[PDB]
């Protein structure tokens, strides 16, 4: 006979002990654990919602491989990326490229609560969610590995984040602030409880039902299974957050997770707004971008918080507001600027899409219809080359993506600019400029691609020049996804 | 030379537009919708383009120059429609 | 238009089609890309000064990291393959034996010898998991990195099987305070103390090629002699066949611990001066393994033959290295 | 450490011992054993090709599940089932009607090697073979059942043998004759090496590349699985030839051998040919049942026949020629019968239909060509009762087949009548009342669908009467299964 | 147009929707059809008397055997799981017991012993083997069947265990003969003439209610307390501890064997007449098994307890159900 | 009543057809057709019908009756094209 679990789980996580040869301090250096003056005894109310122990794990995650690793080998041969709407093929191309190395670079994350809380049961879950992470970055890379031979884009899935592309540097921008650089609680509230919870395990589902409307299930099958490891790693947050704010913190605890959500909510705007509202085929899309934010992301927040003892961020009206605005300006900035990222983007602007997204966002032929009309009337009359660009857009220096809204008749777009010691600085919202405020020190010295181009990092100064210091080159130089079939439609 | 930043009407984004010391208002309009005009804002021939500081409000006569506009390198302009 | 490739970009021209292990596994850290800058925010961050002067300027130096190569060649999915079965083994183990009542026969004495030598070594277990993860984070390579996280789940391995037997010896013999007493015991024993000192110290070497060192290279070989071979001896000895057969299955993690350690040292040493740095670090905590080994041992029955076979075979895992 | 297998896997297969208190014979009953008067010492050179033991079976075939199941569960809320082409469901149903339920009968077929055999090794083989069969028959039952509320006709994967519908005695015709109802050593060879070995082996095959190509992966990956633990059993054959040949026994050996040769061919005839040249797409077609025969299954007779030291059959020239019209004449009994079937049978003679079906057998339309236009002029014209029958066509009492060959130009439809104790019994072909006739007692008491109906078994004794009889009802009643479409392209 | 169905039609109208037993096992076997004719061809070929005479006229009578369903509700998919799992503990021992060389410990007298009592097992185990797949090809419901499918894996398990074990013996003490000499020790030894003759005679026994009594019943509890429980005991005692170990496990599949037997008993004594029938065969084979439990027991070490123990363990399997 | 198997000429497939004793071959050859002609075999009113014994090749007289054809019950009968 076996124990049940319940009974000895306990002693798994009775694991602090008082040290004398070295100190506290010393063995818990406050940069790594952020133990914020609150006492070693104090984390030990830490108590996770899921509970695993190494032989369930271990025996549950031997499952979850074959199954995905079967698929992936019996679908194969079938070649189904061969057909693939080639807006499909995009999403998933930039999914391996911004996700794969940054699921692998968050075992360290994991790593870093797994040794530095002071919280034994985050140290263990913390342990499985290293291994959780370890596992995405493997899986993430095993399967584009497959096309190689098809297009050098796919190479991308691994050498995406080694590069200077606008878009590593907003990922690395993004995970390295979150994940990378923070101490031990700091990552459970950022990362585990904004990001992960907050964010990407809805995203996760929605991407696998996209994946299965579009008829790859190798895919669907791969994002299904990850998704599957979320919680028993994102739950981190929560426990840390009650102690934060049980024990007079509640301030410091609210200030992380402000930055933590807005950060997440930029990078978001332009990995998954554009593939939702452009890059899905028209009859394959289930609702708007927005619709999909409301409902499967934003009560939720309000849902959490409340029940944490916390208040909803000062921006969230904006917030709900740029819901209509950001990501249509985000692929506006990305299909515009195609030849910069590495897989093709879908312009979308297609009729029937047009009244889809006037539908789902009344006002816009009448602000984001406008330039896109131009952009039409010049493939119509046969000058494209008005539709590439010549110069590189500002770059917001907290989210490292272009500064963007709305155009046209209602043109409201606003920078925040900020001075800081003899240098300008330029930030695509009060948010992000908010973020570099209240922690200078933390950004200061950095320099996003305009102004690395501004400085003469980049040689030669032109953009044929700045193609090459991105790594980028002709065959994984992005240009539109259905090879301008969509012209068509006004000639 | 100098660079500042570009907003301009009708557009979605800033952009980065290099001028230089001696050009005026009315040429930094030209350089600027170079990048926005007929690339994604519908030309106006009722119109003028005028040429505001974005961080306050300030509008520019014309006919000055950058030299004289006292400018932070960097810094972002409106470039509106006027008559 | 740049041709599509046989493999990654970072493995062309190799002779040999790629394996599983080095599509999953090779030239996965970023923040080794700037060294001046290994994080895409200001450079004088507290973390950025953490990576430059433990990982970038550590006194151990190879030219590419990235080329090492875990032996075992393990991935995430072998890895779960290959536990889940000697997981079945031990579990079965438990089962089995409990069905028997394996725990009833054992003697008044050797009850007590467990409380004091045998349950305490969840605090020592968990500390080695917390060293071996602090190795994950700060080693100059994804290879690297890889098998101190398998090795890690090792570690958590080991404190779950401590830590369920200690429950079921609870249940059996509930006034020896099994579980409640384990702390204290690890705080205050004297044939603790020697292990406790090592290991914290251990835990705050943060150069990675210290906490290398330190902690697989002197202090595992050192609490796998004592506890796992020299405890796992006695234990069938006394009859205590589940620890012998709980601890010979331990020592298969330990072994392959040993084995990827091996590599690495093998790989040091293509590199003049690295075995120098090597040796100093270790005469620097070798004495305090002796310490370690000197108060458990000791204790044990047969104490000083234990002291003079674990002493000895701690160090020829690392005479063979070099 | 542990033994390599080469060192242990004697000690498995000795296991023969000298009885005592009980004989040889009241041991090995000879009706059960089939010794042939050969030693129990004799049978011990019985040596299996392929070797397994318990712990590589379990540990494999849970790999085999794992993988074919998770796939099931994966494509499942795909509903691909919903949109195949019906010529491919039709396929589907007949599969699952006509084998699901012998597969299972199968273990028991390999129950009997296991406890009867006088050779060790088959002994042991028969029980893995056994094991094998049991998983076949079990998840070839799970499979269709996900189709139940889809259509009544899945069902049949049950029913289909517990009925008297005309397929279901041509089925437990075969099987019962080859591996229900003999000894042994016969089943060794008439069931693993005549029919396993002999010609499912390659059809799996064959059927997973066409599963592929239909676009069903969840099918595709059953058949796939399946295969692979064929030669496992099939091999049981082999040894047992030898050891007959070895033995004095070449004459014993080669009846069995020809005889479980064409009862395999006719039922294959009729449950594969007209899949191969009439349910498949046009497009979808690697090649001919014809030309899949020739290369696939015949020239792998010869090789093993010879290389056992036995001859061709006396029959194998007529089969080679056989090849150009049996399977034809099956199809046309199905269609023309077809609602007394339990799927839709695909017509296959539209026009582009027509001319491959001349290219791959010249002599076509001038034959099975006729028969056809009058159908076609039949629809065509309205009038398409003259399309069902109102008879039943004559039963072969040996494969319990209509009696069918070549029409039209070269009509050649011979009947192999037999008078044999005041009975005249009907012989689809001169093989067919060959086998009869050398084992007259095996059959004699038999009696066919024709038979019972004529003996006043079926009533009331009218087609609605033999369709109850049939356990047959509107909605699994057989038919077409484009609905007629082909039909447009002659007006 | 009759309407699709939930379920399969036989199970239709049964509250709950039929799990994965019920959808994969019930109902399958179709020569229980016509019992004039089973099997498609002449109703007097020897194979139709067979089934006629030692299936359909067995005077263990039940209205509708397919009621029948196996408490554990095995599947061949359930089964590999539960079986690879119990093989990794089992070759896990083997590997790691040998790593330690356990069968260098083990004293001259009990070497003696193993080859004695323990290695010529390999011919019981396969008979039990032939036993209960004859048993699978003559019962009259597939769910009956498929209880002796799995029950003859689980002895062809042991039969493999048996084999291996033997090598190992033989590797180790080369001079005894271990693989050469079980076959006569087999025939001639007093201590096996009891199981033998139980066994020769119970293989004969075609009737499938006889079948299942003589060998589920009196057989195998018999062979199952003597082999397994009693030697089993002994090993562990005389310090095999691996056979004291690998006794144990096979002895969850006789448990489970157990399990069924007993609920296929239960289902018979739903119609009168039946637990006489039952006992009538019992008390036919009884003395067969006694003969057995006494030339093998009493030839062990402390012969009459384990001859009295065994008797009296066995004899409670069959009081359990009635 | 009386069963016979018909092998219609260019039909593939032999049929169970009932008849009478007091049939003709002729009328058989109605009954025959009904089962063949304008559903699997073209007709052919430039030709008649001959009814000939399957087994060995003999030929039947177009007016004789079942009862005098010495015939075997389920025999198999060919149906042919003259003239
Ligand atoms: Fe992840
Ligand atoms: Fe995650
Ligand atoms: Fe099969
Ligand atoms: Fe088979
Ligand atoms: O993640
Ligand atoms: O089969």
């Given at each position: 006979?076996?124990?049940?679990?319940?009974?000895?789980?306990?002693?798994?996580?009775?694991?602090?002990?008082?040290?004398?040869?070295?100190?506290?301090?010393?063995?818990?250096?406050?940069?790594?654990?952020?133990?914020?003056?609150?006492?070693?005894?104090?984390?030990?109310?830490?108590?996770?919602?899921?509970?695993?122990?190494?032989?369930?794990?271990?025996?549950?995650?031997?499952?979850?491989?074959?199954?995905?690793?079967?698929?992936?080998?019996?679908?194969?041969?079938?070649?189904?990326?061969?057909?693939?709407?080639?807006?499909?093929?995009?999403?998933?191309?930039?999914?391996?490229?911004?996700?794969?190395?940054?699921?692998?670079?968050?075992?360290?994350?994991?790593?870093?609560?797994?040794?530095?809380?002071?919280?034994?049961?985050?140290?263990?879950?913390?342990?499985?969610?290293?291994?959780?992470?370890?596992?995405?970055?493997?899986?993430?890379?095993?399967?584009?590995?497959?096309?190689?031979?098809?297009?050098?884009?796919?190479?991308?899935?691994?050498?995406?984040?080694?590069?200077?592309?606008?878009?590593?540097?907003?990922?690395?921008?993004?995970?390295?602030?979150?994940?990378?650089?923070?101490?031990?609680?700091?990552?459970?509230?950022?990362?585990?409880?904004?990001?992960?919870?907050?964010?990407?395990?809805?995203?996760?589902?929605?991407?696998?039902?996209?994946?299965?409307?579009?008829?790859?299930?190798?895919?669907?099958?791969?994002?299904?299974?990850?998704?599957?490891?979320?919680?028993?790693?994102?739950?981190?947050?929560?426990?840390?957050?009650?102690?934060?704010?049980?024990?007079?913190?509640?301030?410091?605890?609210?200030?992380?997770?402000?930055?933590?959500?807005?950060?997440?909510?930029?990078?978001?705007?332009?990995?998954?707004?554009?593939?939702?509202?452009?890059?899905?085929?028209?009859?394959?899309?289930?609702?708007?971008?927005?619709?999909?934010?409301?409902?499967?992301?934003?009560?939720?927040?309000?849902?959490?918080?409340?029940?944490?003892?916390?208040?909803?961020?000062?921006?969230?009206?904006?917030?709900?507001?740029?819901?209509?605005?950001?990501?249509?300006?985000?692929?506006?900035?990305?299909?515009?600027?195609?030849?910069?990222?590495?897989?093709?983007?879908?312009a979308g602007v297609s009729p029937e899409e047009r009244e889809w997204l006037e539908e789902k966002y009344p006002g816009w032929n009448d602000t984001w219809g406008?330039?896109?009309?131009?952009?039409?009337?010049?493939?119509?009359?046969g000058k494209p080359e008005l539709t590439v660009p010549e110069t590189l857009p500002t770059i917001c220096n907290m989210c490292n993506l272009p500064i963007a809204?709305?155009?046209?008749?209602?043109?409201?777009?606003?920078?925040?600019?900020?001075?800081?010691?003899?240098?300008?600085?330029?930030?695509?919202?009060?948010?992000?400029?908010?973020?570099?405020?209240?922690?200078?020190?933390?950004?200061?010295?950095?320099?996003?691609?305009?102004?690395?181009?501004?400085?003469?990092?980049?040689?030669?100064?032109?953009?044929?020049?700045?193609?090459?210091?991105?790594?980028?080159?002709?065959?994984?130089?992005?240009?539109?996804?259905?090879?301008?079939?969509?012209?068509?439609?006004?000639? | 030379?100098?660079?500042?930043?570009?907003?301009?009407?009708?557009?979605?984004?800033?952009?980065?537009?290099?001028?230089?010391?001696?050009?005026?208002?009315?040429?930094?309009?030209?350089?600027?919708?170079?990048?926005?005009?007929?690339?994604?804002?519908?030309?106006?021939?009722?119109?003028?383009?005028?040429?505001?500081?974005?961080?306050?409000?300030?509008?520019?006569?014309?006919?000055?120059?950058?030299?004289?506009?006292?400018?932070?390198?960097?810094?972002?302009?409106?470039?509106?429609?006027?008559? | 238009?740049?041709?599509?490739?046989?493999?990654?970009?970072?493995?062309?021209?190799?002779?040999?089609?790629?394996?599983?292990?080095?599509?999953?596994?090779?030239?996965?850290?970023?923040?080794?890309?700037?060294?001046?800058?290994?994080?895409?925010?200001?450079?004088?961050?507290?973390?950025?000064?953490?990576?430059?002067?433990?990982?970038?300027?550590?006194?151990?130096?190879?030219?590419?990291?990235?080329?090492?190569?875990?032996?075992?060649?393990?991935?995430?999915?072998?890895?779960?393959?290959?536990?889940?079965?000697?997981?079945?083994?031990?579990?079965?183990?438990?089962?089995?034996?409990?069905?028997?009542?394996?725990?009833?026969?054992?003697?008044?004495?050797?009850?007590?010898?467990?409380?004091?030598?045998?349950?305490?070594?969840?605090?020592?277990?968990?500390?080695?998991?917390?060293?071996?993860?602090?190795?994950?984070?700060?080693?100059?390579?994804?290879?690297?990195?890889?098998?101190?996280?398998?090795?890690?789940?090792?570690?958590?391995?080991?404190?779950?099987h401590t830590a369920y037997r200690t429950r079921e010896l609870a249940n059996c013999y509930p006034d020896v305070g099994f579980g409640k007493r384990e702390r204290?015991?690890?705080?205050?024993?004297?044939?603790?103390?020697?292990?406790?000192?090592?290991?914290?110290?251990?835990?705050?070497?943060?150069?990675?090629?210290?906490?290398?060192?330190?902690?697989?290279?002197?202090?595992?070989?050192?609490?796998?002699?004592?506890?796992?071979?020299?405890?796992?001896?006695?234990?069938?000895?006394?009859?205590?066949?589940?620890?012998?057969?709980?601890?010979?299955?331990?020592?298969?993690?330990?072994?392959?611990?040993?084995?990827?350690?091996?590599?690495?040292?093998?790989?040091?040493?293509?590199?003049?001066?690295?075995?120098?740095?090597?040796?100093?670090?270790?005469?620097?905590?070798?004495?305090?393994?002796?310490?370690?080994?000197?108060?458990?041992?000791?204790?044990?029955?047969?104490?000083?033959?234990?002291?003079?076979?674990?002493?000895?075979?701690?160090?020829?895992?690392?005479?063979?290295?070099?």
């Open positions: 006979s076996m124990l049940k679990r319940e009974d000895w789980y306990d002693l798994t996580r009775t694991t602090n002990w008082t040290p004398k040869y070295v100190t506290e301090n010393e063995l818990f250096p406050e940069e790594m654990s952020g133990a914020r003056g609150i006492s070693m005894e104090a984390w030990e109310k830490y108590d996770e919602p899921y509970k695993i122990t190494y032989p369930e794990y271990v025996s549950i995650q031997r499952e979850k491989d074959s199954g995905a690793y079967s698929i992936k080998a019996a679908l194969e041969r079938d070649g189904f990326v061969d057909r693939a709407d080639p807006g499909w093929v995009s999403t998933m191309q930039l999914h391996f490229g911004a996700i794969a190395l940054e699921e692998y670079a968050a075992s360290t994350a994991e790593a870093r609560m797994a040794r530095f809380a002071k919280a034994p049961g985050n140290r263990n879950m913390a342990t499985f969610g290293m291994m959780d992470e370890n596992r995405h970055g493997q899986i993430q890379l095993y399967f584009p590995y497959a096309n190689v031979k098809r297009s050098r884009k796919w190479d991308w899935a691994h050498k995406a984040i080694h590069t200077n592309e606008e878009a590593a540097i907003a990922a690395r921008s993004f995970f390295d602030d979150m994940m990378m650089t923070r101490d031990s609680v700091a990552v459970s509230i950022m990362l585990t409880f904004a990001f992960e919870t907050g964010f990407s395990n809805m995203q996760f589902l929605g991407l696998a039902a996209d994946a299965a409307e579009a008829g790859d299930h190798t895919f669907a099958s791969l994002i299904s299974s990850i998704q599957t490891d979320e919680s028993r790693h994102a739950q981190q947050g929560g426990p840390s957050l009650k102690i934060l704010v049980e024990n007079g913190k509640k301030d410091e605890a609210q200030q992380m997770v402000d930055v933590a959500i807005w950060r997440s909510w930029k990078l978001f705007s332009v990995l998954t707004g554009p593939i939702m509202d452009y890059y899905t085929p028209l009859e394959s899309r289930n609702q708007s971008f927005k619709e999909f934010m409301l409902e499967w992301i934003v009560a939720q927040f309000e849902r959490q918080l409340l029940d944490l003892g916390l208040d909803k961020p000062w921006y969230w009206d904006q917030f709900m507001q740029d819901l209509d605005e950001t990501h249509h300006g985000m692929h506006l900035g990305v299909w515009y600027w195609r030849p910069t990222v590495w897989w093709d983007p879908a406008q330039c896109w009309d131009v952009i039409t009337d010049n493939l119509v009359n809204h709305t155009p046209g008749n209602k043109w409201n777009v606003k920078d925040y600019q900020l001075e800081y010691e003899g240098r300008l600085y330029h930030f695509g919202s009060e948010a992000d400029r908010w973020c570099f405020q209240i922690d200078p020190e933390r950004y200061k010295n950095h320099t996003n691609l305009v102004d690395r181009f501004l400085k003469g990092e980049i040689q030669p100064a032109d953009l044929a020049g700045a193609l090459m210091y991105m790594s980028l080159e002709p065959g994984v130089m992005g240009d539109d996804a259905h090879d301008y079939e969509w012209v068509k439609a006004y000639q | 030379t100098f660079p500042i930043m570009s907003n301009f009407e009708r557009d979605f984004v800033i952009q980065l537009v290099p001028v230089d010391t001696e050009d005026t208002m009315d040429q930094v309009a030209e350089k600027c919708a170079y990048h926005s005009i007929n690339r994604r804002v519908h030309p106006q021939p009722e119109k003028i383009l005028r040429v505001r500081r974005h961080e306050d409000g300030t509008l520019f006569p014309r006919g000055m120059i950058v030299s004289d506009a006292g400018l932070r390198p960097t810094e972002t302009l409106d470039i509106i429609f006027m008559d | 238009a740049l041709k599509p490739l046989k493999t990654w970009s970072h493995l062309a021209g190799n002779r040999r089609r790629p394996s599983e292990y080095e599509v999953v596994s090779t030239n996965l850290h970023y923040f080794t890309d700037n060294p001046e800058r290994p994080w895409e925010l200001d450079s004088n961050l507290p973390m950025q000064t953490w990576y430059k002067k433990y990982c970038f300027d550590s006194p151990l130096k190879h030219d590419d990291w990235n080329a090492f190569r875990d032996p075992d060649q393990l991935v995430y999915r072998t890895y779960n393959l290959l536990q889940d079965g000697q997981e079945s083994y031990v579990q079965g183990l438990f089962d089995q034996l409990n069905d028997r009542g394996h725990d009833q026969m054992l003697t008044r004495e050797w009850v007590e010898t467990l409380a004091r030598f045998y349950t305490p070594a969840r605090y020592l277990f968990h500390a080695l998991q917390m060293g071996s993860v602090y190795i994950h984070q700060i080693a100059p390579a994804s290879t690297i990195t890889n098998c101190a996280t398998y090795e890690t789940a090792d570690h958590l391995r080991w404190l779950t204290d015991v690890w705080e205050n024993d004297p044939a603790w103390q020697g292990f406790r000192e090592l290991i914290e110290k251990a835990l705050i070497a943060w150069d990675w090629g210290e906490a290398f060192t330190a902690i697989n290279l002197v202090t595992k070989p050192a609490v796998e002699e004592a506890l796992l071979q020299q405890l796992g001896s006695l234990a069938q000895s006394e009859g205590d066949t589940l620890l012998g057969l709980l601890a010979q299955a331990q020592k298969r993690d330990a072994e392959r611990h040993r084995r990827w350690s091996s590599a690495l040292v093998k790989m040091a040493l293509e590199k003049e001066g690295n075995r120098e740095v090597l040796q100093k670090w270790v005469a620097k905590w070798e004495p305090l393994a002796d310490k370690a080994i000197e108060a458990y041992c000791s204790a044990l029955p047969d104490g000083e033959n234990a002291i003079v076979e674990a002493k000895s075979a701690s160090r020829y895992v690392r005479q063979m290295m070099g």
